[PDB]
Design an enzyme around this catalytic site. Structure first.
Site, PDB file in Angstrom:
ATOM      1  CB  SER A 167      -1.592  -1.624  -8.141  1.00 18.21           C
ATOM      2  OG  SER A 167      -2.168  -2.080  -6.930  1.00 18.21           O
TER       3      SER A 167
ATOM      4  CD  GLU B 129      -3.704 -34.096  -4.125  1.00 18.58           C
ATOM      5  OE1 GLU B 129      -3.767 -34.660  -5.237  1.00 18.58           O
ATOM      6  OE2 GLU B 129      -4.716 -33.747  -3.483  1.00 18.58           O
TER       7      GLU B 129
ATOM      8  CE  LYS C  52     -11.190  -4.208 -13.794  1.00 22.70           C
ATOM      9  NZ  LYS C  52     -10.733  -3.863 -15.167  1.00 22.70           N
ATOM     10  CG  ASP C  53     -12.207  -6.837  -7.295  1.00 27.01           C
ATOM     11  OD1 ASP C  53     -12.031  -6.244  -8.380  1.00 27.01           O
ATOM     12  OD2 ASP C  53     -11.425  -6.730  -6.328  1.00 27.01           O
TER      13      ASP C  53
ATOM     14  CG  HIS D   9      -1.867   1.182   1.247  1.00 27.10           C
ATOM     15  ND1 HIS D   9      -1.678   2.250   2.098  1.00 27.10           N
ATOM     16  CD2 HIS D   9      -2.989   1.458   0.542  1.00 27.10           C
ATOM     17  CE1 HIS D   9      -2.643   3.132   1.916  1.00 27.10           C
ATOM     18  NE2 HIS D   9      -3.452   2.676   0.977  1.00 27.10           N
TER      19      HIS D   9
HETATM   20  C1  LIG Z   1      -5.465  -0.886  -2.912  1.00 26.04           C
HETATM   21  O1  LIG Z   1      -5.088  -2.229  -3.123  1.00 26.04           O
HETATM   22  C2  LIG Z   1      -5.609  -3.131  -2.465  1.00 26.04           C
HETATM   23  C3  LIG Z   1      -6.657  -3.867  -3.021  1.00 26.04           C
HETATM   24  O2  LIG Z   1      -6.494  -4.362  -4.139  1.00 26.04           O
HETATM   25  C4  LIG Z   1      -6.718  -3.622  -5.321  1.00 26.04           C
HETATM   26  C5  LIG Z   1      -7.510  -4.569  -2.174  1.00 26.04           C
HETATM   27  O3  LIG Z   1      -8.295  -5.373  -2.675  1.00 26.04           O
HETATM   28  C6  LIG Z   1      -7.334  -4.557  -0.794  1.00 26.04           C
HETATM   29  C7  LIG Z   1      -8.549  -4.717   0.093  1.00 26.04           C
HETATM   30  C8  LIG Z   1      -9.010  -6.154   0.167  1.00 26.04           C
HETATM   31  C9  LIG Z   1      -8.123  -7.208   0.678  1.00 26.04           C
HETATM   32  C10 LIG Z   1      -7.458  -8.146  -0.286  1.00 26.04           C
HETATM   33  C11 LIG Z   1      -7.897  -7.332   2.168  1.00 26.04           C
HETATM   34  C12 LIG Z   1      -8.440  -8.645   2.723  1.00 26.04           C
HETATM   35  C13 LIG Z   1      -7.357  -9.697   2.795  1.00 26.04           C
HETATM   36  C14 LIG Z   1      -6.729 -10.044   4.079  1.00 26.04           C
HETATM   37  C15 LIG Z   1      -6.587  -9.002   5.149  1.00 26.04           C
HETATM   38  C16 LIG Z   1      -6.217 -11.445   4.319  1.00 26.04           C
HETATM   39  C17 LIG Z   1      -6.379 -11.811   5.790  1.00 26.04           C
HETATM   40  C18 LIG Z   1      -7.541 -12.759   5.974  1.00 26.04           C
HETATM   41  C19 LIG Z   1      -7.958 -13.167   7.325  1.00 26.04           C
HETATM   42  C20 LIG Z   1      -7.372 -12.491   8.528  1.00 26.04           C
HETATM   43  C21 LIG Z   1      -8.977 -14.270   7.497  1.00 26.04           C
HETATM   44  C22 LIG Z   1      -9.809 -14.048   8.755  1.00 26.04           C
HETATM   45  C23 LIG Z   1     -10.807 -15.175   8.886  1.00 26.04           C
HETATM   46  C24 LIG Z   1     -11.193 -15.704  10.204  1.00 26.04           C
HETATM   47  C25 LIG Z   1     -10.727 -15.019  11.454  1.00 26.04           C
HETATM   48  C26 LIG Z   1     -12.053 -16.943  10.289  1.00 26.04           C
HETATM   49  C27 LIG Z   1     -12.839 -16.952  11.595  1.00 26.04           C
HETATM   50  C28 LIG Z   1     -14.319 -16.987  11.296  1.00 26.04           C
HETATM   51  C29 LIG Z   1     -15.298 -16.792  12.375  1.00 26.04           C
HETATM   52  C30 LIG Z   1     -14.824 -16.392  13.741  1.00 26.04           C
HETATM   53  C31 LIG Z   1     -16.773 -16.984  12.117  1.00 26.04           C
HETATM   54  C32 LIG Z   1     -17.044 -18.372  11.549  1.00 26.04           C
HETATM   55  C33 LIG Z   1     -17.419 -19.312  12.672  1.00 26.04           C
HETATM   56  C34 LIG Z   1     -16.607 -20.502  12.960  1.00 26.04           C
HETATM   57  C35 LIG Z   1     -15.514 -20.900  12.014  1.00 26.04           C
HETATM   58  C36 LIG Z   1     -16.870 -21.325  14.200  1.00 26.04           C
HETATM   59  C37 LIG Z   1     -17.846 -22.456  13.889  1.00 26.04           C
HETATM   60  C38 LIG Z   1     -19.259 -21.923  13.831  1.00 26.04           C
HETATM   61  C39 LIG Z   1     -20.132 -21.901  15.016  1.00 26.04           C
HETATM   62  C40 LIG Z   1     -21.504 -21.306  14.912  1.00 26.04           C
HETATM   63  C41 LIG Z   1     -19.663 -22.478  16.331  1.00 26.04           C
HETATM   64  C42 LIG Z   1     -18.956 -21.425  17.180  1.00 26.04           C
HETATM   65  C43 LIG Z   1     -19.895 -20.906  18.245  1.00 26.04           C
HETATM   66  C44 LIG Z   1     -19.367 -20.423  19.530  1.00 26.04           C
HETATM   67  C45 LIG Z   1     -17.950 -20.742  19.912  1.00 26.04           C
HETATM   68  C46 LIG Z   1     -20.262 -19.634  20.460  1.00 26.04           C
HETATM   69  C47 LIG Z   1     -19.461 -18.679  21.341  1.00 26.04           C
HETATM   70  C48 LIG Z   1     -18.889 -17.565  20.496  1.00 26.04           C
HETATM   71  C49 LIG Z   1     -18.186 -16.426  21.103  1.00 26.04           C
HETATM   72  C50 LIG Z   1     -18.765 -15.741  22.304  1.00 26.04           C
HETATM   73  C51 LIG Z   1     -16.881 -15.941  20.512  1.00 26.04           C
HETATM   74  C52 LIG Z   1     -17.123 -14.959  19.369  1.00 26.04           C
HETATM   75  C53 LIG Z   1     -17.553 -15.694  18.120  1.00 26.04           C
HETATM   76  C54 LIG Z   1     -16.598 -16.478  17.322  1.00 26.04           C
HETATM   77  C55 LIG Z   1     -17.101 -17.571  16.427  1.00 26.04           C
HETATM   78  C56 LIG Z   1     -15.128 -16.189  17.396  1.00 26.04           C
HETATM   79  C57 LIG Z   1      -6.273  -3.834  -0.262  1.00 26.04           C
HETATM   80  C58 LIG Z   1      -6.057  -3.807   1.222  1.00 26.04           C
HETATM   81  C59 LIG Z   1      -5.412  -3.126  -1.089  1.00 26.04           C
HETATM   82  O4  LIG Z   1      -4.317  -2.784  -0.642  1.00 26.04           O
HETATM   83  C1  LIG Z   2     -19.195 -13.901  -2.106  1.00 25.15           C
HETATM   84  C2  LIG Z   2     -19.999 -12.957  -1.215  1.00 25.15           C
HETATM   85  C3  LIG Z   2     -19.736 -11.513  -1.630  1.00 25.15           C
HETATM   86  C4  LIG Z   2     -20.886 -10.636  -1.146  1.00 25.15           C
HETATM   87  C5  LIG Z   2     -22.179 -11.080  -1.826  1.00 25.15           C
HETATM   88  C6  LIG Z   2     -22.724  -9.937  -2.678  1.00 25.15           C
HETATM   89  C7  LIG Z   2     -22.917  -8.704  -1.797  1.00 25.15           C
HETATM   90  C8  LIG Z   2     -24.050  -7.845  -2.354  1.00 25.15           C
HETATM   91  C9  LIG Z   2     -23.766  -7.511  -3.816  1.00 25.15           C
HETATM   92  C10 LIG Z   2     -25.069  -7.097  -4.496  1.00 25.15           C
HETATM   93  C11 LIG Z   2     -25.292  -5.593  -4.343  1.00 25.15           C
HETATM   94  C12 LIG Z   2     -23.996  -4.838  -4.629  1.00 25.15           C
HETATM   95  C13 LIG Z   2     -24.224  -3.351  -4.364  1.00 25.15           C
HETATM   96  C14 LIG Z   2     -24.671  -2.676  -5.660  1.00 25.15           C
HETATM   97  C15 LIG Z   2     -23.979  -1.322  -5.793  1.00 25.15           C
HETATM   98  C16 LIG Z   2     -24.504  -0.391  -4.702  1.00 25.15           C
HETATM   99  O1  LIG Z   2     -25.651  -0.421  -4.411  1.00 25.15           O
HETATM  100  O2  LIG Z   2     -23.642   0.496  -4.048  1.00 25.15           O
HETATM  101  C17 LIG Z   2     -22.512   0.849  -4.792  1.00 25.15           C
HETATM  102  C18 LIG Z   2     -21.248   0.620  -3.969  1.00 25.15           C
HETATM  103  C19 LIG Z   2     -20.365   1.863  -4.051  1.00 25.15           C
HETATM  104  O3  LIG Z   2     -20.944   2.895  -3.306  1.00 25.15           O
HETATM  105  P1  LIG Z   2     -21.377   4.287  -4.076  1.00 25.15           P
HETATM  106  O4  LIG Z   2     -21.682   5.350  -3.048  1.00 25.15           O
HETATM  107  O5  LIG Z   2     -20.249   4.753  -4.965  1.00 25.15           O
HETATM  108  O6  LIG Z   2     -22.715   4.008  -4.996  1.00 25.15           O
HETATM  109  C20 LIG Z   2     -23.160   4.999  -5.875  1.00 25.15           C
HETATM  110  C21 LIG Z   2     -24.127   5.913  -5.126  1.00 25.15           C
HETATM  111  N1  LIG Z   2     -24.828   5.136  -4.119  1.00 25.15           N
HETATM  112  O7  LIG Z   2     -20.565  -0.478  -4.496  1.00 25.15           O
HETATM  113  C22 LIG Z   2     -20.508  -1.581  -3.639  1.00 25.15           C
HETATM  114  O8  LIG Z   2     -20.843  -1.474  -2.508  1.00 25.15           O
HETATM  115  C23 LIG Z   2     -20.015  -2.927  -4.159  1.00 25.15           C
HETATM  116  C24 LIG Z   2     -20.559  -4.035  -3.261  1.00 25.15           C
HETATM  117  C25 LIG Z   2     -19.729  -5.300  -3.457  1.00 25.15           C
HETATM  118  C26 LIG Z   2     -19.325  -5.864  -2.097  1.00 25.15           C
HETATM  119  C27 LIG Z   2     -17.827  -6.153  -2.102  1.00 25.15           C
HETATM  120  C28 LIG Z   2     -17.518  -7.146  -3.219  1.00 25.15           C
HETATM  121  C29 LIG Z   2     -16.008  -7.257  -3.410  1.00 25.15           C
HETATM  122  C30 LIG Z   2     -15.395  -7.984  -2.217  1.00 25.15           C
HETATM  123  C31 LIG Z   2     -13.898  -7.697  -2.163  1.00 25.15           C
HETATM  124  C32 LIG Z   2     -13.244  -8.633  -1.149  1.00 25.15           C
HETATM  125  C33 LIG Z   2     -12.008  -7.962  -0.556  1.00 25.15           C
HETATM  126  C34 LIG Z   2     -11.336  -8.916   0.429  1.00 25.15           C
HETATM  127  C35 LIG Z   2     -12.347  -9.357   1.485  1.00 25.15           C
HETATM  128  C36 LIG Z   2     -11.660 -10.264   2.504  1.00 25.15           C
HETATM  129  C37 LIG Z   2     -12.712 -10.923   3.392  1.00 25.15           C
END
Ligand SMILES: COC1=C(OC)C(=O)C(C/C=C(/C)CC/C=C(\C)CC/C=C(\C)CC/C=C(\C)CC/C=C(\C)CC/C=C(\C)CC/C=C(/C)CC/C=C(\C)CC/C=C(\C)CCC=C(C)C)=C(C)C1=O
Ligand SMILES: CCCCCCCCCCCCCCCC(=O)OC[C@H](COP(=O)(O)OCCN)OC(=O)CCCCCCCCCCCCCCC
Ligand SMILES: CCCCCCCCCCCCCCCCCC(=O)OC[C@H](COP(=O)([O-])OCC(O)COP(=O)([O-])OC[C@@H](COC(=O)CCCCCCCCCCCCCCCCC)OC(=O)CCCCCCCCCCCCCCCCC)OC(=O)CCCCCCCCCCCCCCCCC
Ligand SMILES: CCCCCCCCCCCCCCCCCC(=O)OC[C@H](COP(=O)([O-])OCC(O)COP(=O)([O-])OC[C@@H](COC(=O)CCCCCCCCCCCCCCCCC)OC(=O)CCCCCCCCCCCCCCCCC)OC(=O)CCCCCCCCCCCCCCCCC
Ligand SMILES: CCCCCCCCCCCCCCCCCC(=O)OC[C@H](COP(=O)([O-])OCC(O)COP(=O)([O-])OC[C@@H](COC(=O)CCCCCCCCCCCCCCCCC)OC(=O)CCCCCCCCCCCCCCCCC)OC(=O)CCCCCCCCCCCCCCCCC
Ligand SMILES: CCCCCCCCCCCCCCCC(=O)OC[C@H](COP(=O)([O-])OCC[N+](C)(C)C)OC(=O)CCCCCCCCCCCCCCC
Ligand SMILES: CCCCCCCCCCCCCCCC(=O)OC[C@H](COP(=O)([O-])OCC[N+](C)(C)C)OC(=O)CCCCCCCCCCCCCCC
Ligand code: HEC
Ligand code: HEM
Ligand code: HEM
Lengths: 86, 387, 245, 57, 122, 60, 87
Positions: free
Chosen positions: B206, B272, B228-229, B202
């Site tokens: 890019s 694999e 676009k994603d 960041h």
């Molecule tokens: C500008 O350029 C850039 C872009 O590009 C152009 C971008 O795109 C992006 C922006 C987008 C990205 C690419 C950023 C995102 C990517 C990352 C940051 C990668 C990192 C990913 C992670 C950290 C993964 C995190 C996932 C987790 C933590 C999984 C955990 C999930 C849960 C806690 C919920 C699911 C539940 C589970 C698995 C448990 C089983 C289910 C049950 C119901 C049983 C559990 C029940 C209990 C235990 C009850 C008690 C619960 C309590 C009280 C505890 C709280 C609840 C929990 C479950 C914890 C950036 C930044 C950018 O620079």
């Molecule tokens: C697989 C599951 C994915 C989610 C499922 C689909 C979610 C709902 C999508 C259907 C409705 C879309 C909204 C229509 C546009 C709108 O209404 O709003 C428009 C807004 C912009 O805001 P604006 O003010 O410019 O709009 C103009 C004036 N109001 O664009 C959006 O928000 C896009 C919503 C997409 C959600 C994010 C998808 C990409 C995920 C990236 C993952 C990054 C890493 C994550 C790590 C965990």
């Protein structure tokens, strides 16, 4: 506030670090006024035809790879036969 | 000042996901990172769910997996999704690396991001092995026995490391316990390293297909690149659901549905598919230590790329030689995978040796030579145009 | 290596489960289960299919209970220790024919009859290889010999399999009256074994269709919306007024 | 209702329009005015902003 | 470090230059940056101190023209098109408007790269 | 009337938008369930257990 | 960088967000010139004595009352479930 960071190349809006601009005019239209998918098939077809024509040979000549694959498979199968051990 | 720019956590979200200048002409090959993040999240959730029904031991792992398959509610979805997502992870990883390699993204100022990505790749490869070695079927048992024996190649303390890793004298209960314990921890380290990857990226932004500075034209990420994603996400979902609901054991060999018999050696001991080329590189060299050295170098050579590109241009968009040689290298990689997959027969040995030689020549000889030649030709033609 | 040590390639067939929308033919499943019980349960084992797995697929609850009540099982300690026997229930697995691997090896020369629960998925070829194996016992060609106790089958890797021809003409009398030959019985038992390998085919194939349809519609809508929103960028006009000093 | 504002106004802080309050408090802009230019069968209704606090537009 | 193109070595022998001219012409046609109207000197990287200093020693009109060229190229690349056959960059306008300034800056930096290493031979 | 009333009712405030989305999703789930059930039932003709019961069960 | 952060009350070195100071001279010595373990025992003893004599009852009263009711409750509960307690 926090600290003076290192030397980067992005800044933010306003101070993006680019050069000074002059005499540039830009137009556009609201997305609710323009018709989507207008000039799509023609432009896409022309661009795909041009891309196939120009960068085609850089990929086509996957050409010798398939031939060496086929020849290797055929020769390996032939050598594991009755007449291949003669 | 709006709330999103004032509160700390909302500012953290906004600076990375909502308001962030990006190049305005990045193609569809820039979406694979979001796909990687989604696949990693899916893997984490599915593994957490699957860990609630798995018993890590020699005499109970396979039966536990079968009970998951045919007795637990909707267990087939869980297992198939885990396996197929783990398979798709490496496809998207290879596409990401290819995108980074084709456009010359390893050059400054994005070297740290490249190194972090290489480390993440190594961690992901290590994590995949432990994950697949858990079910304790035939191929898992024999492949683990073969691979963990490679640690004996180090001089001194040779077999001691193998014994320490095995926790005994052969693949048994303790090594499965160790592998299950370690397979839970590594994905969290991978997520932390991904966060480091993003925070390192960041600071400079890019690149773009053209390869020139993009500071003149930028658009915010919020309305444009968050939509676009979505297409790529839905396409990946439609790709993975077909595998999960019509061919769950697609990438899966026939020898992976039998109990681990330690007396009958299978005809072929292969890992694999996504680890096949490195196995071929290892098997190419007749020597033993040289084999593991070359296998390590085949992945560690990506760190030498920045100091091997003597090109005034940044990318392959305007590099006639690079476009040809990149696809040549890709074809060689596919040939290496095919050779590693199959038997070590007569002609296949020669083919694999030649492919390995070409693979190690491409990174070390071809790149500087053709970059220098392109620079020289362009400079000469430009210099000889006025007179 | 040599095809003699690799086995002749199997023969491709067409099955109802191969179609995109079709599931399982359950009459063939019942016939295959009958064939397995009356010809196979003597030597092979299927210790992963319970009696309750059959109610709704090839039998009803009363029929399954009555069938399971015949066999006998051990039922833990009682009072002063001891190990007694009890009639079968609806939650017990199919009775294995041999106690352990050693007894199975001793009974059938020196070969161990593999468990049949997941043998369709664990063989290179699927249903086709098994069906071609059962109906491929031919007279040995010229120049080859077979040691005592060894049979000739080209589809088996090595062309020597230690399993005498299992299925013969009119071995079983099917309930529906189908003329039971070697080929029909082999096909039915192959179908039953494939069901035993993956017993959830119908439900999985049922939900996959709806999931695919919903995903396709969502993908089309997403492409249209992406095309709509990006218009003010793909259709810009840039004009350069030269800055004369 | 929207009103006008200017940083050189004597009573700039005490104006009773929320936009003026926010702009004066955060020094967002120099001045702004509202116009309702009308024509025979159409017109315009908007604002006109002048500022030098670049980066917070 | 930095590009190490050896055209100066080749230009010593007129035989090699005469032989290699058609190949260079074909290669420059094949590279295809002229289809976007760009000059060759717009493709060099500007992320170090030397290039960032050199870009500040350009005439104002040259900088404005470069900005326009890059903006037009980006706008063309957005919608996947190229300029028509009449607006391609002609060989007359494909000159080196950045090499001398960068060379001067590098020479100044290299100049200082000597006083610190100075030793006394006695 | 025309297309103004449709905007006024559904897509005017965010709350009405979300309520319409949720109700439409609730009914679309049932619609897709019915469609896929009909398609699957017509796909398998004469090769289901309930269909083949009168060929085995009754003749006990 | 920029990003136009919010409003806080800490700042950093140089601009700590405090009122302007004037005429506050401050002297200090070097750690290598001063002597550790100098006057530690006397000052520490005086401070501990003053703190004990000052805070004191603030802690003494509630803990003492709690201990008294603890002892009484234990004694009474032991007595009541014995022979003579139930009668
Ligand atoms: C500008 O350029 C850039 C872009 O590009 C152009 C971008 O795109 C992006 C922006 C987008 C990205 C690419 C950023 C995102 C990517 C990352 C940051 C990668 C990192 C990913 C992670 C950290 C993964 C995190 C996932 C987790 C933590 C999984 C955990 C999930 C849960 C806690 C919920 C699911 C539940 C589970 C698995 C448990 C089983 C289910 C049950 C119901 C049983 C559990 C029940 C209990 C235990 C009850 C008690 C619960 C309590 C009280 C505890 C709280 C609840 C929990 C479950 C914890 C950036 C930044 C950018 O620079
Ligand atoms: C697989 C599951 C994915 C989610 C499922 C689909 C979610 C709902 C999508 C259907 C409705 C879309 C909204 C229509 C546009 C709108 O209404 O709003 C428009 C807004 C912009 O805001 P604006 O003010 O410019 O709009 C103009 C004036 N109001 O664009 C959006 O928000 C896009 C919503 C997409 C959600 C994010 C998808 C990409 C995920 C990236 C993952 C990054 C890493 C994550 C790590 C965990
Ligand atoms: C592995 C190999 C691939 C890895 C990665 C490669 C790229 C990643 C793929 C992402 C796909 C993105 C994409 O094109 O879709 C968005 C794309 C929109 O892109 P855009 O904003 O116009 O700009 C990009 C252009 O496509 C750019 O246009 P262009 O000028 O460059 O021309 C290219 C043009 C080429 O167009 C043509 O030549 C066709 C002309 C007629 C179009 C026909 C309609 C197609 C639908 O592209 C298309 O039109 C292709 C669109 C078809 C989408 C395909 C979806 C799945 C394919 C993804 C990978 C496949 C691998 C799996 C293989 C399966 C078996 C193993 O969607 C559309 O094409 C619009 C569809 C409209 C839907 C109408 C119905 C709405 C109902 C109301
Ligand atoms: C009507 C008839 C058919 C139409 C049906 C197509 C519908 C669906 C296809 C989608 C589509 O084409 O549009 C989406 C997509 C939308 O366009 P865009 O993404 O905005 O434009 C991208 C650039 O502008 C494009 O820039 P460019 O064309 O100037 O540059 C050439 C382009 C590619 O163009 C070519 O030169 C090939 C395409 C030629 C077409 C077929 C010629 C055959 C003769 O370069 C790349 O993008 C290469 C990517 C670099 C790396 C990615 C792959 C590397 C794999 C990694 C290997 C292993 C890793 C090793 C490392 C690990 C070691 C440890 O169109 C394309 O980009 C088309 C180019 C090919 C990509 C998609 C391929 C999928 C299958 C299509 C086959 C074509 C026939
Ligand atoms: C459950 C938890 C409940 C309580 C939670 C909070 C308690 C915090 C933890 C206390 C630990 C820190 C601490 O007080 O001691 C650090 C303290 C340093 O802190 P400081 O900068 O003086 O500030 C604390 C003052 O006491 C400034 O306070 P003050 O001026 O009001 O004086 C109060 C004075 C109390 O006054 C006296 O007791 C009179 C002086 C007799 C000294 C008693 C011990 C010697 O306190 C002491 O000086 C205590 C000395 C050692 C404390 C024993 C640690 C037990 C932890 C309790 C759990 O260490 C010493 O003063 C040690 C002196 C001798 C060490 C050097 C030995 C010579 C070299 C060794 C060569 C052998 C080879
Ligand atoms: C269950 C999972 C989803 C659970 C719900 C997930 C969504 C939660 C809310 C979305 C994320 C939080 C909003 C973030 C943006 C924001 O802060 O909006 C607050 C706005 C005012 O924000 P502003 O535009 O910056 O103006 C203020 C500027 N001053 C004057 C201070 C200088 O003030 C407003 O007008 C609205 C204030 C509302 C604050 C959030 C309330 C919590 C949500 C209540 C439940 C809503 C109904 C939910 C129905 C589904
Ligand atoms: C942890 C809670 C999850 C989170 C669950 C709640 C969060 C939903 C995830 C997507 C969030 C998208 C935010 C987009 C910004 C936004 O909220 O705007 C509302 C838009 C319409 O906004 P508009 O285009 O500007 O039009 C409105 C016109 N007005 C009414 C203002 C005059 O209307 C919409 O955006 C509708 C989007 C679809 C809402 C239906 C629910 C579907 C998502 C929930 C189920 C899927 C969950 C997937 C999770 C990966
Ligand atoms: C006639 C009584 C009978 C006996 C005895 C018997 N089987 Fe088999 N048998 C198989 C299959 C499938 C294999 C696995 C062949 C392989 O692994 O290549 C096998 C293999 C064997 C093997 C191991 C052969 C080897 O070389 O390892 C033995 C022993 C065996 N069967 C014994 C299907 C059957 C079927 C079809 C339901 C029936 C009936 C059947 N078998 C009936 C019998
Ligand atoms: C990048 C992350 C991950 C990758 C690449 C990965 C990969 C794999 C692979 C390839 C298998 C083999 C499955 C098979 O062959 O059928 C597997 C199994 C398994 N994984 Fe993961 N996994 C990841 C994350 C996790 C997490 C986070 C957990 C636990 C919280 C987990 C728990 C398990 C378990 C219990 C199994 C055995 C179950 C089975 O094999 O059916 N995995 N993993
Ligand atoms: C879980 C694994 C990964 C995650 C979450 C991740 C995340 C991302 C994302 C979202 C991007 C922006 C998209 C792009 O610029 O292409 C990116 C860029 C990049 N990634 Fe990754 N990545 C991962 C793996 C890798 C690997 C394995 C490598 C290299 C071996 C790598 C090297 C790079 C580089 C060099 C860039 C910058 C590309 C550019 O700016 O043009 N990443 N990363």
């Amino acid at each position: 506030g926090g600290a003076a960071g290192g030397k980067t190349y992005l800044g933010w809006w306003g101070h993006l670090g680019g050069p000074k601009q002059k005499g540039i005019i830009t137009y556009s239209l609201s997305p609710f006024q323009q018709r989507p998918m207008a000039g799509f098939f023609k432009t896409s077809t022309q661009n795909m035809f041009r891309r196939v024509m120009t960068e085609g040979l850089y990929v086509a000549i996957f050409g010798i790879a398939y031939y060496i694959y086929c020849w290797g498979k055929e020769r390996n199968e032939f050598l594991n036969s009755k007449h291949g051990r003669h | 000042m709006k709330i999103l720019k004032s509160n700390p956590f909302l500012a953290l979200a906004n600076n990375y996901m909502i308001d962030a200048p990006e190049p305005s002409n990045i193609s569809y090959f820039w979406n694979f990172g979001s796909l990687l993040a989604c696949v990693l999240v899916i893997q984490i959730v599915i593994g957490i769910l699957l860990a609630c029904f798995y018993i890590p031991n020699m005499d109970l792992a396979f039966l536990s997996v079968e009970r998951i398959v045919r007795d637990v509610n909707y267990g087939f979805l869980l297992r198939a999704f885990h396996a197929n997502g783990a398979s798709f992870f490496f496809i998207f990883l290879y596409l990401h690396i290819g995108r980074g390699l084709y456009y010359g993204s390893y050059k400054y100022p994005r070297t740290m991001t490249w190194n972090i990505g290489v480390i993440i790749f190594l961690l992901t490869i290590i994590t995949a092995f432990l994950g697949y070695c858990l079910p304790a079927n035939q191929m898992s048992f024999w492949g683990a026995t073969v691979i963990t024996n490679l640690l004996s190649a180090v001089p001194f303390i040779g077999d001691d490391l193998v014994h320490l890793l095995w926790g005994g004298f052969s693949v048994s209960n303790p090594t499965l316990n160790r592998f299950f314990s370690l397979h839970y921890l590594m994905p969290f380290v991978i997520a932390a390293l991904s966060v480091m990857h993003l925070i390192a990226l960041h600071t400079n932004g890019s690149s773009n297909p053209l390869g020139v500075t993009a500071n003149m034209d930028r658009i915010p990420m919020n309305p444009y690149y968050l939509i676009k994603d979505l297409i790529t996400i839905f396409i990946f979902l439609i790709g993975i659901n077909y595998m999960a609901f019509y061919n769950p054991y697609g990438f899966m060999e026939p020898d992976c549905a039998l109990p681990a018999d330690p007396l009958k050696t299978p005809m072929s001991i292969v890992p694999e598919w996504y680890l096949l080329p490195f196995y071929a590189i290892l098997r190419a060299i007749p020597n033993f230590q040289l084999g593991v050295i070359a296998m390590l170098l085949s992945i560690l050579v990506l760190l030498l790329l920045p100091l091997l590109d003597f090109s005034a241009i940044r990318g392959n968009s305007f590099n006639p030689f690079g476009k040809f040689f990149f696809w040549t290298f890709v074809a060689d990689f596919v040939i290496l995978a095919w050779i590693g997959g199959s038997h070590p027969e007569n002609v296949f040995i020669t083919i694999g040796a030649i492919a390995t030689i070409f693979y190690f020549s491409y990174f070390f000889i071809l790149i500087p030579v053709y970059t220098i030649l392109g620079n020289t030709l362009i400079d000469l033609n430009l210099s000889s145009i006025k007179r | 290596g040599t095809p003699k040590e690799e086995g002749l390639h199997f023969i491709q067939h067409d099955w109802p489960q191969s179609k995109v929308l079709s599931g399982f033919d359950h009459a063939s499943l019942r016939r295959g289960f009958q064939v397995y019980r009356e010809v196979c349960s003597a030597c092979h084992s299927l210790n992963l299919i319970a009696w309750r797995h059959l109610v709704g697929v090839t039998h009803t609850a009363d029929e399954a209970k009555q069938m399971a009540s015949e066999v006998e099982y051990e039922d833990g300690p009682d009072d002063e220790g001891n190990m007694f026997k009890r009639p079968g229930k609806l939650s017990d697995f199919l009775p294995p024919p041999y106690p352990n691997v050693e007894a199975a090896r001793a009974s059938n020369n020196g070969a161990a009859p593999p468990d049949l629960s997941c043998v369709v998925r664990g063989r290179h070829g699927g249903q086709d290889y098994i069906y071609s194996l059962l109906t491929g016992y031919t007279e040995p060609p010229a120049g080859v010999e077979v040691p005592d106790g060894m049979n000739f089958n080209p589809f088996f890797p090595g062309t020597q399999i230690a399993m005498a021809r299992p299925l013969f003409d009119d071995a079983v009398e099917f309930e529906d009256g189908t003329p039971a030959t070697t080929a029909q019985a082999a096909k039915d038992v192959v179908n039953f074994l494939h069901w035993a390998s993956e017993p959830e085919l119908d439900i999985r194939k049922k939900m996959g269709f709806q999931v695919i349809t919903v995903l396709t519609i969502l993908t089309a809508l997403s492409m249209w919306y992406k095309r709509f929103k990006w218009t003010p960028i793909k259709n810009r006009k840039i004009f350069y007024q030269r800055p004369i000093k | 209702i929207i009103g006008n504002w200017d940083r050189a106004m004597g009573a700039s802080p005490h104006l009773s329009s929320r936009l003026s309050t926010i702009v004066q408090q955060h020094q967002l802009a120099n001045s702004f005015m509202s116009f309702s230019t009308s024509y025979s069968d159409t017109g315009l209704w908007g604002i006109y902003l002048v500022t030098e606090n670049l980066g917070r537009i | 470090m930095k590009p190490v193109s050896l055209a100066k070595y080749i230009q010593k022998s007129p035989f090699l230059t005469k032989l290699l001219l058609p190949i260079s012409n074909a290669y420059v046609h094949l590279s295809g940056y002229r289809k976007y109207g760009l000059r060759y000197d717009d493709l060099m990287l500007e992320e170090n101190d030397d290039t960032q200093k050199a870009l500040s020693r350009l005439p104002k009109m040259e900088s404005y023209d470069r900005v326009y060229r890059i903006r037009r190229a980006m706008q063309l690349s957005i919608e996947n098109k190229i300029l028509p056959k009449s607006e391609w960059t002609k060989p007359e306008e494909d000159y080196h408007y950045l090499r001398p300034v960068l060379a001067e800056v590098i020479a100044e930096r290299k100049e200082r790269e000597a006083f610190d290493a100075l030793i006394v031979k006695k | 009337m025309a297309s103004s009333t449709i905007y006024n009712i559904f897509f005017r405030r965010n709350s009405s938008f979300y309520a319409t989305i949720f109700v439409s999703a609730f009914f679309a789930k049932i619609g897709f369930d019915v469609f896929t059930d009909s398609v699957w039932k017509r796909a398998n003709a004469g090769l289901t257990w309930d269909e083949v019961k009168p060929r085995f069960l009754n003749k006990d």
